[PDB]
Symmetry: D2
Subunit: 48 residues, 4 copies
């Protein structure tokens, strides 16, 4: 139990923010791991 | 068309982040407007 | 170490989605617990 | 004005949800456009 799930979200504004996020989170699995690591490094520089 | 929607999210980690968010976004409608305005002020102080 | 944090987000679209979310998540602490429980119940009805 | 921004988020749980999201949203720019389009198609199948 960890595959696709259904998220009931009320309100267009709310749905859109999460929908774009669902795409960002889901797509993060389709981005080459080595390329994500590099980004994490650029981000590791400063969380500010 | 702006009521509750269904968001298919794959991966437990992904689902949990959005699920907690769905709750935060949805609940934001149940928090007294005047009280949210006050918070926005405290937040308006600095986005840093 | 769990108070306010700084999140560096690149891209306006990205910043806005998270900013509105920061407000939703942060405000969730300002909404009466008993009132949130009631919502969670309405949400507990179905995650679909 | 649309580059990196700073998001002040209070509470570890809150910060973590948005932080992982900041990474997902930001990384979405590093994932080949043609590959994202394919995903969007798989997602276009059903929003349920």
């Amino acid at each position: 139990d960890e595959d696709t799930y259904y998220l009931q979200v009320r309100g267009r504004e709310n749905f859109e923010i999460l929908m774009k996020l669902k795409e960002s989170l889901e797509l993060m699995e389709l981005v080459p791991q080595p390329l994500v690591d590099s980004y994490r490094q650029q981000q590791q520089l400063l969380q500010r």
